[PDB]
Amino acid sequence: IIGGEFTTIENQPWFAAIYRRHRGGSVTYVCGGSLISPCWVISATHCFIDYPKKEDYIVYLGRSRLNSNTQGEMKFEVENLILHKDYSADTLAHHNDIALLKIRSKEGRCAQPSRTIQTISLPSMYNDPQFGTSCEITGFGKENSTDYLYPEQLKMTVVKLISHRECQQPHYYGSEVTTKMLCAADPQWKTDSCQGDSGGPLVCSLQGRMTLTGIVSWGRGCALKDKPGVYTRVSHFLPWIRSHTKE
């Protein structure tokens, strides 16, 4: 996250921290994720596509710090790693950038809701906030483009939803942004998601309810003028989510 504020998991209790283990025993952070039910985390395909082996992954819930333990945190393995069959990446644009991780504790259980671990609601078919709406993003992503390490503490910020019409302007992304994507940015270009924020939630308060409107997907640089964050439009993927979580 560029700009914004440090935060704690209690304010973002659906946030999942996803790591990958390496031969040698080193674990690195991979991407964000959102808990949409006790057994299911949703994230972004591009996070996993080069390493589609579920055994490599570790998911934490209730975690506020990157490399240390948070009271109440819970650790999960991945029982099923589901990538979107039609995922693809162009120079900038990532398509069908959405994934599902079925989680389970070492004892075989799914998540136990608590003060710091909660599900986030999905949106309803093609019902997204209007452009100009303020929404929040959360992640352990870079604080500056020149950074090579991630912040130790979870961050959040607030960005505004940008219309498809504006986002498809030639100085923005032209036709590379599709209707299955959502653009969001700061009107002054001072705050944004960045590398390492992928897979994490774009949350909008919709009809009184906190809704998972987007998933951090792609963009050109971070907090660049005329270059919004691009998000998977969750509301266009409800039949895919339902079909894969129904089992």
Ligand X SMILES: Cc1cccc(C)c1OC[C@@H](C)N
Q: Which residues bind ligand X (CB under 6 A)?
A: 192-195, 197-198, 216, 218-219, 221-222, 229
Nearer to ligand X by C-beta: 94 or 236? 94
**Catalytic residue from among 34, 95, 97, 128:** 97
The burial of 32, by beta-carbon neighbours within 10 Å (0-12 exposed, 13-18 middle, 19 or more buried), is given as: buried
Catalytic site residue 186?
Answer: no
**Shortest distance (Å) from residue 221 CB to ligand X:** 6
Residue number with the shortest CB distance to ligand X?
A: 219
Q: Are 121 and 210 in contact (CB under 8 A)?
A: yes
Nearer to ligand X by C-beta: 12 or 70? 12
Closest CA to 116 of 39, 37, 61, 197: 61
**Shortest distance (Å) from residue 58 CB to ligand X:** 20
Q: Are 161 and 136 in contact (CB under 8 A)?
A: no
Q: Are 32 and 9 in contact (CB under 8 A)?
A: no
Nearer to ligand X by C-beta: 111 or 222? 222
Catalytic site residue 147?
Answer: no
Nearer to ligand X by C-beta: 82 or 184? 184
Q: Are 102 and 80 in contact (CB under 8 A)?
A: yes
**Shortest distance (Å) from residue 79 CB to ligand X:** 26
**Shortest distance (Å) from residue 162 CB to ligand X:** 12
Q: Give the C-alpha distances (Å, rounded to integers) separating 72 from 12, 20, 106.
A: 14, 21, 16
**Catalytic residue from among 34, 43, 64, 198:** 198
Q: Are 60 and 75 in contact (CB under 8 A)?
A: yes
Nearer to ligand X by C-beta: 143 or 197? 197
**Shortest distance (Å) from residue 183 CB to ligand X:** 10
Catalytic site residue 192?
Answer: no
What lies within 8 Å, CB to CB, of 101 at 6+ separation is 16, 18, 33, 40, 41, 42, 43, 54, 57, 59, 78, 80, 81, 82
**Catalytic residue from among 46, 84, 94, 244:** 46
DSSP-derived secondary structure letter, 37:
E
**Which residues are annotated as catalytic?**
46, 97, 198
